[PDB]
Write a protein that binds this ligand. Structure first.
Ligand SMILES: CCOc1cc(OCC#Cc2ccc3ccncc3c2)ccc1C[NH3+]
Length: 316
């Protein structure tokens, strides 16, 4: 149901096309800021409900320049709504196709942002496990924002040990997937590719792939370190962060650390919320610090975003 949602947001166009979920552009009424709202249906999710809720819980604990920001989770009889940072530049998927394949130096810029995000995810004790271009969006500055739940699918990005249901480390699976992404960025097609699941899986397990003539020797060496069938022989995140290839154009390791972590509440945002809700400062801070990802969380985070853009920290 939409009744509560529409008390806080005005719906604009559909932007995201899907199968179990729609995405809408919307305005957050109190702040006037634009958001994307992902609409998921509970019955259509079925027994993925728990797994989806677990991942939503994980997202509540991430805060990073290359990870899409969550503002609000609203649950009803049949729906879960996720109110998220609007990323107007569209999927990395469509960008790759539009350009055929990226230059080595553009792929380096973009790939460093992926590594930044994924390294941070790992540092917080999580692993993504479904990295692929459909799960990466560009903002209006053409910076990458990692998402999830995006639509043989992700089989082509899946690590061999993952594919065969055996024991694995999420971090190692993520490195394999980033290797597939690296290939695609530079080639415009997949390293392992086929008409059926059995054929595709067979190829993945063997680990052989073509090396186009335009790939540099250093690109070739990095690809082989990331696409090692045996997870133990795969490059670690530690060694990826300062890899020679990674630092070839910009001679500094990947800045993976969060650039705007939540430390203390922002006083200007608290002040404005206090005047608005007719609360004193202590009472308002106490409410905000519950971090329920309700409408109050959303309002706080969106005022914080306003301030970051130099706009008056003001509610309408
Ligand atoms: C590390 C990221 O973790 C997660 C990200 C999630 O993102 C859900 C989403 C989205 C989305 C879809 C379409 C958009 C269109 C335009 N602008 C923004 C959009 C955002 C969900 C869960 C996790 C946790 N693994």
């Amino acid at each position: 149901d939409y009744d509560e949602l529409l008390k806080y947001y005005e719906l604009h166009e559909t932007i995201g096309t899907g199968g179990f979920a729609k995405v809408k552009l919307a305005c957050h009424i109190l702040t006037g800021e634009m958001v994307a709202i992902k609409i998921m249906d509970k019955n259509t999710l079925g027994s993925d409900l728990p797994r989806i809720k677990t991942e939503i819980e994980a997202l509540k604990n991430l805060r990073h320049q290359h990870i899409c920001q969550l503002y609000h989770v609203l649950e009803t009889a049949n729906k879960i709504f996720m109110v998220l940072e609007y990323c107007p530049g569209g999927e990395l998927f469509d960008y790759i196709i539009s350009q055929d394949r990226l230059s080595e130096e553009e792929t380096r810029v973009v790939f460093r942002q992926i590594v930044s995000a994924v390294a941070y995810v790992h540092s917080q004790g999580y692993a993504h496990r479904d990295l692929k271009p459909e799960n990466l969006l560009f903002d209006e500055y053409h910076k990458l924002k990692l998402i999830d739940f995006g639509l043989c699918g992700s089989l082509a990005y899946a690590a061999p040990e993952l594919i065969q249901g055996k024991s694995y480390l999420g971090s190692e699976a993520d490195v394999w997937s980033m290797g597939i992404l690296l290939y695609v960025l530079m080639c415009g097609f997949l390293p392992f590719d086929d008409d059926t699941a059995a054929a595709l899986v067979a190829k993945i397990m063997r680990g052989k792939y073509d090396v186009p003539k335009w790939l540099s020797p250093s690109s070739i060496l990095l690809l082989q370190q990331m696409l090692q069938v045996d997870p133990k022989k795969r490059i670690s995140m530690k060694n990826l962060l300062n890899h020679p290839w990674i630092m070839q154009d910009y001679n500094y390791p990947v800045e993976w650390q969060s650039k705007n972590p939540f430390i203390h509440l922002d006083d200007d945002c608290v002040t404005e919320l206090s005047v608005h809700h007719r609360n004193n400062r202590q009472t308002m801070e106490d409410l905000i610090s519950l971090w329920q990802y309700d409408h109050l969380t959303a309002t706080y985070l969106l005022l914080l975003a306003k301030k970051a853009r130099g706009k008056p920290v003001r509610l309408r």
